Amino acid sequence: AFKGGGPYGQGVTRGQDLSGKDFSGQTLIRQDFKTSILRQANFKGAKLLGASFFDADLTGADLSEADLRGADFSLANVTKVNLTNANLEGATMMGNTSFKGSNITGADFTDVPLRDDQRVYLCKVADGVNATTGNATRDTLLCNL
Numbered sequence: 001a002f003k004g005g006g007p008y009g010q011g012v013t014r015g016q017d018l019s020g021k022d023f024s025g026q027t028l029i030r031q032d033f034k035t036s037i038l039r040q041a042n043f044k045g046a047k048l049l050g051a052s053f054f055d056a057d058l059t060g061a062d063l064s065e066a067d068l069r070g071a072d073f074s075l076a077n078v079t080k081v082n083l084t085n086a087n088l089e090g091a092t093m094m095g096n097t098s099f100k101g102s103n104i105t106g107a108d109f110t111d112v113p114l115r116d117d118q119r120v121y122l123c124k125v126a127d128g129v130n131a132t133t134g135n136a137t138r139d140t141l142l143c144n145l
Contacts (some may be wrong), residue, residue, distance in 0.1 A: 067087050070091060
């Protein structure tokens with residue numbers, strides 16, 4: 001329970017080194033993690049609607065079962081992140097974002113705009129149904145049409 005729980009002021013989370021910090025299950029709607037370091041951070045089941053991970057480093061983080069609707073992952077390092085059952089409906093991930101090594105089993109990528117190259121990679125590793133939405137990960141990604 002990071003700093004006993006919060007809510008957290010934006011100054012607490014923005015441009016900070018928060019590696020290995022535990023935010024699991026917390027309400028973090030529109031929390032500003034822009035350009036923070038979040039390696040191995042725990043966001044399992046966190047509520048992160050509209051949160052900013054703009055140019056954050058999420059390497060190895062747990063975002064499994066997180067509510068990430070409308071969150072911004074543009075320019076983020078999302079390598080080796082657990083996104084099992086994460087809801088990314090309407091999130092953004094512009095530019096040089098890397099998802100290399102990430103587990104996206106049952107992730108929901110509805111209305112997430114993707115470049116061809118991002119869709120190609122994600123579709124190589126995409127499977128499952130979202131425990132929450134029953135959308136098929138491959139369909140949200142439009143892998144097969």
